[PDB]
């Protein structure tokens, strides 16, 4: 189980997420904010 | 299970997410905000 | 399971998401905001 | 399951999402806002 | 399942999404706002 | 990715698949053999 | 990734799959043999 | 990753899979043989 | 990672899998043989 209770007044979120792929040949991956339950298979 | 309870007053979210793919040959991946349950298969 | 309860007053979301694909040959991927349940297969 | 409850007063969303495909040969991918359940297959 | 409940007063959405395809040979992809359930196959 | 390499000599497949829907009011579903990649959304 | 290498001499497959839906009101589901990669969303 | 190497001489598979749904009101599910990579979301 | 090397001479598999759903109201689940990598989300 997983419950996510978020009670709040005056909230600020600053998410910044990035990647630099130079000289690559192949990429496998996932990049997101705020995922509710579940998985990623790489 | 996964419950996502979000009770709020005056909320601010700043999500910034990016990637730089230079000199690449192949890319596999996913890039989003706020996903509700589930998965990604890479 | 996945429940997404979002009760709110005065909310601001700023999502900015981008990628720079230079010198590429092939791309596989997905790029969105606010996805409700489900998956991506890469 | 996936429920998406969004109760709100004075809400502002700014989504900006883009990609720059230069020197490419082939592209496979999807780019949207606000998708309600489901998947993408890449 | 996927339910999308959106109760609201004074709401503003600004979606801007674009891509620059230069020097390309081939493109496969989809680009939209606000899709209600379902999938894309790339 | 998904590769399906099937090299064979003297092969026999017997698929039999059926369903009995009695006293039903509503049906949602799909029923097939040998599907090459992709998904079903129910 | 998923590779499926099937090298064979004298092979026999007997798949039999069925369901009995009596007194039902509603059905959601999928029923097949030999699916190559991908998913089902129920 | 997932590789599936199946080298064989004289092979026999007998898969039999069924379900009996009596007095039901609602069904969500999937029922297949031999799926190559990927997932099911229930 | 997951590699599946299956080198064989004279092989026999007998899979039999079933379920009896009586007096049910709701079902969520998946039922298959031989799945190559990946997941199920219930």
UniProtKB/Swiss-Prot annotation, chains A, B, C, D, E, F, G, H, I:
Substitution effect: residue 10 to F: 60-70% zinc-induced amyloid-beta protein 28 aggregation
Source domain of life: Eukaryota
Annotated site residue numbers, Susceptible to oxidation: 35
Ranges for region Interaction with PSEN1: 24-42
Site (Implicated in free radical propagation): 33
Binding site for Zn(2+) 2: 6, 10, 13-14
Annotated effect of mutating residue 22 to K: In CAA-APP; Italian type
Effect of residue 5 to G: 60-70% zinc-induced amyloid-beta protein 28 aggregation
Residues listed as glycosylation sites in the UniProt record: 10
Amino-acid positions noted as binding Cu(2+) 2 in the UniProt annotation, renumbered to this chain: 6, 10, 13-14
Subcellular location: Cell surface
Site positions for Cleavage: 1-2, 7-8, 16-17, 19-20, 40-41
Function: More effective reductant than amyloid-beta protein 40. May activate mononuclear phagocytes in the brain and elicit inflammatory responses.
Subunit note: Interacts with FPR2.
UniProt-recorded name of the protein: Amyloid-beta protein 42
Species this chain originates from: Homo sapiens
Residue window of the full protein shown: 672 to 713 of 770
């Amino acid at each position: 189980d997983a419950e996510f209770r978020h009670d709040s007044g005056y909230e600020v979120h600053h998410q910044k997420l990035v990647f630099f792929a130079e000289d690559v040949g192949s990429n496998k991956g996932a990049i997101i904010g705020l995922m509710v339950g579940g998985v990623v298979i790489a």
